[PDB]
Design a protein around this nucleic acid. Structure first.
Ligand SMILES: [Mg+2]
Ligand SMILES: [Mg+2]
Ligand SMILES: [Mg+2]
Lengths: 152, 152
DNA sequence: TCTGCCTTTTTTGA
DNA sequence: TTAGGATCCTTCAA
DNA sequence: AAAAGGCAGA
DNA sequence: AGGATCCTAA
């Protein structure tokens, strides 16, 4: 586990509270045990003119990647262990996204159990609902209620 | 001078590079000496549901105020002396907006002289142009060249 | 089955 | 005349 | 910013 | 985010 230095984390926590996004999703998928899978994504968006800043961020975090979507680019981190390690260290300095980060950490820690039982899966889905409720969510479709309905 | 805590400045520098703005303007107004004046503004924008974060910023910076503009709110600092003191302290920690901050400080140091001469005002006006060039400027109208039609 | 990465869209919150 | 504040707008960069 | 849908390797 | 324009009291 990479240890990040404090001044880096302090600055990055400010930048993330501004331009970053901690995204939790429930995605239908017929080949998963409960017909859904979870996705947890840390993203930082910036105008492509400033892609260099996201490229520097890949070097600094040591994991993740940058993708261009024409006018804007995004630093993305999904791999679960590195995401856990990174958010564990960032979260104490977050002010606006602190609660999202800690929910993602709780989800991650419970993933093994979530995959064992429908009730446990549903409960972790409600934690995803709570993250979306904290974000400025506007286009969300699949919720823990969606999952529950697939009771059956 | 109010001296700001390092951990505060680091976090805020990150938050500023993300959601903040360092704005320099030339405003036409026929009741001023050179038919224009300079306006320098430090701004942090946020959705009004998170206005409390901006209100907190007024207490932490010790000066400035928050304006509600409907769906979003803005922390604003204009008063030239505390602006100079604040930017002086924040600038070392800025990564995207360091040059804008240093141009504002440069302009602020010359504000006394800038009336002295038509030549010198015009020069300071080009420093305003340079801040706008660094920003993601899209609606700018009055530039140093507008001023130069002081050639009458 | 499961995870990470690829692609694209929506609607603001800057 | 001036500085600081008030109001409104545009176009994205999140 | 914050989702949506989808592929394919492990 | 990054402007443009208008108000007003000292
Ligand atoms: Mg933001
Ligand atoms: Mg930004
Ligand atoms: Mg932003």
């Amino acid at each position: 586990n990479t240890k990040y230095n404090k001044e880096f984390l302090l600055y990055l926590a400010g930048f993330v509270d501004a331009d970053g996004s901690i995204i939790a999703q429930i995605a239908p998928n017929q080949s998963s045990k409960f017909k859904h899978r979870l996705k947890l994504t840390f993203q930082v968006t910036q105008k492509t003119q400033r892609r260099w800043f996201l490229d520097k961020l890949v070097d600094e975090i040591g994991v993740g990647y940058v993708r261009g979507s024409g006018s804007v680019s995004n630093y993305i981190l999904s791999e679960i262990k590195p995401l856990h390690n990174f958010l564990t260290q960032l979260q104490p300095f977050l002010k606006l996204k602190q609660k999202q980060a800690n929910l993602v950490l709780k989800i991650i820690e419970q993933l093994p159990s979530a995959k064992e039982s429908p009730d446990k899966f549903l409960e972790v889905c409600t934690w995803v609902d709570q993250i979306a409720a904290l974000n400025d969510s506007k286009t969300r479709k699949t919720t823990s209620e969606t999952v529950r309905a697939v009771l059956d």
